[PDB]
């Protein structure tokens, strides 16, 4: 089975389970 997309641009799932910007390094490192 396909897996869903990534989260938005530096995006990820927090634990609330919601896409959030990086703030500890979205790749920009």
Not at 11 to 19: A, I, K
């Amino acid at each position: 089975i396909s897996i869903d997309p990534p989260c938005r641009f530096c995006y990820h799932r927090d634990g609330s389970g919601n896409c959030v910007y990086d703030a500890y390094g979205c790749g920009a490192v």
